[PDB]
Design a protein around this ligand. Structure first.
Ligand SMILES: c1ccc2oc([C@H]3CCCNC3)nc2c1
Length: 60
C-alpha cells in the first residue's frame, strides 16, 4: 500500500468537501483498500485508502 497505515495511527482524511479532517484508524482492510476511521466527533466511517494520509506531515 502506498502510505503505510496501522491501527491507532492519527490520519488526515480528505472528505467530499475537499477538506482534510483529523481522525484515528480503528481498523485496516488492505484487501478492499479501506480503513475504519473515527473522527473528532467520534463518528466512524469507512474511508478509501487514496483519501488517507498520516497526520504527521513529512518534514514535520
Ligand atoms: C473521508 C470519508 C469520510 C469522512 O468523514 C469526515 C468527517 C466530516 C465531518 C466530521 N465527521 C466526520 N471526514 C471524512 C473523510
Amino acid at each position: 500500500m502506498r502510505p503505510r497505515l496501522w491501527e491507532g495511527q492519527d490520519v488526515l482524511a480528505r472528505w467530499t468537501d475537499g477538506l482534510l479532517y483529523l481522525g484515528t484508524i480503528k481498523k485496516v482492510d488492505s484487501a478492499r483498500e479501506v480503513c475504519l476511521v473515527q473522527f473528532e466527533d467520534d463518528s466512524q466511517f469507512l474511508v478509501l485508502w487514496k483519501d488517507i494520509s498520516p497526520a504527521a506531515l513529512p518534514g514535520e
